[PDB]
Subunit: 419 residues, 3 copies
Amino acid sequence: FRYMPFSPAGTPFGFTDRRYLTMNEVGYVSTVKNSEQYSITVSFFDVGRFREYHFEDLFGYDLCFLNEKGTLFGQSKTGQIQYRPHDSIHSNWTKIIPLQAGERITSVAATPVRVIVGTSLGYFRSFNQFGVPFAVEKTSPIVALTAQNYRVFSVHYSQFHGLSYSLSELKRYYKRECPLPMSLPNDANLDYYNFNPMGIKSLFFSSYGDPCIFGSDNTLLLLSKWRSPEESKWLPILDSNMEIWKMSGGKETTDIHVWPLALAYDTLNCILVKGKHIWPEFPLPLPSEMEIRMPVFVKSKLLEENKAIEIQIPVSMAAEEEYLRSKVLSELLTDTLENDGEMYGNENEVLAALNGAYDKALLRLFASACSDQNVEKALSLAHELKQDRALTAAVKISERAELPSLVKKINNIREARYE
Amino acid sequence: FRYMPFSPAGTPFGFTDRRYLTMNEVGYVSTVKNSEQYSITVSFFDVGRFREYHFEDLFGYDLCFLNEKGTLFGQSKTGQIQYRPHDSIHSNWTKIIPLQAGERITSVAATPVRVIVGTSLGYFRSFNQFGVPFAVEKTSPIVALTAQNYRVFSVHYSQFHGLSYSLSELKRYYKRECPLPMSLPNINSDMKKDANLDYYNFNPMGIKSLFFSSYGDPCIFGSDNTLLLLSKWRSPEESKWLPILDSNMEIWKMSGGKETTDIHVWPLALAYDTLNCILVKGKHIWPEFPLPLPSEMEIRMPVFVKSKLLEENKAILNKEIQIPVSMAAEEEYLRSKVLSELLTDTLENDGEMYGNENEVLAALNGAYDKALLRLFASACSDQNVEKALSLAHELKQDRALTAAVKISERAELPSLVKKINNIREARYEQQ
Amino acid sequence: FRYMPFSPAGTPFGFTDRRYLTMNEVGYVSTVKNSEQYSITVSFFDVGRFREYHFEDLFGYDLCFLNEKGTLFGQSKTGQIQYRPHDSIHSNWTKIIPLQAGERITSVAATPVRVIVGTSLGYFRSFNQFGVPFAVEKTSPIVALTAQNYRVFSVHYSQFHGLSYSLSELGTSSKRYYKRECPLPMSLPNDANLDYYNFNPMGIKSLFFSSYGDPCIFGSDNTLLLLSKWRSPEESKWLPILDSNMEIWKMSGGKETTDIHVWPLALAYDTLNCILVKGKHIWPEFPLPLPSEMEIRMPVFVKSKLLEENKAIEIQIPVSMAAEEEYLRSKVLSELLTDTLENDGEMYGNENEVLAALNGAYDKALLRLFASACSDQNVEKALSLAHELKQDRALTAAVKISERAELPSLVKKINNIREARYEQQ
């Protein structure tokens, strides 16, 4: 098995002389073949805060990581890394990572306080933002790295360890090489899978500090309850293939692809790649937005319904999605608030609006249940309502449906909830 | 590797037109090929309590789970499931599970409060008993599922994840994809010429069945025909898998020390210390129509050496395999030790469930002390003082310590008597 | 994949008639082909405390474990084990481990209260020191075992489970299970040494607890791994603390030798007790030379850079470059010793002084690094190094170095650290 140098949202050269070293919400880094050298260009999306620049690479950096404070570069074969702070007030530094025969740097990342290097032999080397060595650990061979502030999210693979992930903050490991439930891959894109065998398109922390990964199955995975070792769970919160299928009107397209950049609360910042290649090429299009959706849609049922004719989605199928999505986001946001506090200023209102949408979707499900003479299923749905005003609304729907026992029982719920 | 639809104690079609979808202590579900459709029959062992029924299957359900409240059916390719309550007062419901290209349902299970679906892509979908979605999780590819009340026991396999299991209660995960110490089948040249090859094509993992015991402890039964039980699962750091029944070994002892290849065990459930099963006779290891009457196999710890058992059962006969009391006591001590720990944990956490647990536990701890005393007597009979004293420290009841003293006196070991009395004095004082 | 009987620092027969069953800090056990039987010799390094003895082996023991209380022997095919207490007051006992067809005993170990057996089918069988069966468990196949006092360090492997380890402490009056089959970040192997890799497929040369009770392993990559913070489940980490290949390369003057090899016996604080094997074989042979010593070194050096520096100037290492290794090594050892003291207390009588001297070497290395930072007018990098200083007198010296380097802002900021720490007392 060959360990290849990984960087978030990086693209292959292909048949061109240029490619993207890395991409995210901050910007993107490109390198161009220039004879015996390379031409690196660091670009940003917010031109008001940052100033795009260029320089010549004499080493051939194939590793890169970009944040709001600086840019980190690495050469997987020689072991040379270089950190370049955005503000020239702070000076650049270059270091050489010790490598045994056959050992390659597989992934690098950087925070305002840490610089991290992982190798194919499972060496984990950390530094501060100035290049001072702080630790040298032995882990399962690292294949992917991301970091946000003090949190570090690593992915490991070996034929003797399997596919795992680790999550650490400043040292403390919430997760130590726990199994990672990401799907692995099974053509014009042959160049990509030689470039990224794992098929990890990108990985990152969300805007609220939750670990996310986006693999070859084009599904956004989010780790919930990562603060609770026994309550942790990976959530599929966006099947990008399905949503595109619904956008395109139910046709099997092979010209639209998603390239993940970041997750902002409920919206995936991405690049819509159009063509035969699944990876974006120069020039880079304008960043798009894709709202997350729980994988509760059935393609077959969607085909049955949409025979007469965007794909139209049934109220109950849509109510289930909105119910689950609100439930998921509510738990995450509540955890973030109770542990890390308000971060952007509107969380209490966002959470409030969230619990409202949670109840509306449930009532839609409650109505269909009553509309199907299903008494027991309706009562079960009633118990899942949060606000007392929602239980009140449930009674009104229950009265119109000629279900007296339901009305009593829902009122009995109000009796218990009063206490 | 092909992910195949799994169901507890399910059997393959083979070259016949009928098979069992699933089996347990409640009953068994069979399906028969009927032209372009299937004929499903749900049968029960307690004919007084439940009503056997039939219906025609137009979808081709290859997944099934059976409990005391209802029956769950699943179609691995279309993603269609159907829950059928035993009492017609409660209505049936059918749902279609979202499936990606190539994704198959690999296992389903149901409790009075939960309905669970697992797929080959590692999607884990849970519902209430009425079909209301509660959660959608991503895990390692699921190959087997079982559930009891709010607890869920899943088995996972991938060539990139290995063989693992999870234990959860609804949310909380006592165990998250921890290694599962279960043997996998060995499909070599002899197995490819074997008559039971159809079973391992139908169930690659060789998991014959898995279930929670009557006291709520996770059990699994694989191709090595050994019942495995997860002890101390409530304490994440103290958990351990216990081989509590080598069915190959026990049949070997029943048969008088001979290697039979015509008797096979088909696991249904575990009730305290007794494995509810079907004794299959023939060349096939899976039960066939008509289904024989359920048997009962008592659990035994695998601590015996086949050669040693032969020597002893030869000496006894010239003076089933007969086992010397002192030798058998080692197995009896360990089995009682194991069952006592399990039951004590069950009581302290979940209380009496059937009403007699405290009496069962009392009788259990009694057999525990008796076996220890037999080992203690053998130690004393060999002038092994240190070994005898070590056994004494493992005694539970104070009256057992007293009996140990008499054995020490009859064996004329006075120093032993003093130390054993100091144990009683020390334990008396600690109260 | 073939499971093979493992014992710590055990060697293969090769083309000779003798080999070592196991070697550790206590002594070594050897077996010699004696016609149709074997001649086992149990030897000790402390000839004053223990008594070397011999006996004839009619069973063909290929498994062995030696501690301060007794010697454990095992036959992987018949399943026969025998525990031999060093003090003849306690009688020997022999047991036969139940084995299915093809099942082999893969590893054994012993504590003062337990005798442990692991098999290739993943069976785990324990006994007390007198032969009373205590447990029969099913685990991931155990391939290596070591023990110190009441602590047990196991290694597991299967093609369906991967490479893992477990750490437990079952004492006289307390149970504690620190690690249960967590992933083990050890490297696996990929000729004259062919006899050894058929003898030890995993390539685990040896594994053991350090003299202070920390788990160590030494694999085919000849790098000593040490488990730090193993008492804290969320803080645990494996540390590469000795690349023996790298250190030999530095001893030999930067040349790639293929005739000098390390055979690990134990870890004493900061020193690896080992046998320096010279020749084509990587394993020691009879008769055994005198044990050597190898001081641990953090793998933070680049071969190319070391050569350039030693040409511009054994390999000579610049003070500013060597300080990084010394800083990290002291940092690592300090954390370990601090953990050991707070939990298990003083063990040998000099620990409080060792720790003090350790924190002193820690501060010196930082100050030398701090000087280099000042020497490059790098204020922020220098200030960051200052925050890592322990002693207030070290902060005082840092000010002095900051003054001499004409970095006034640095002097001001470092004083604020001293000021803040003064009130926070």
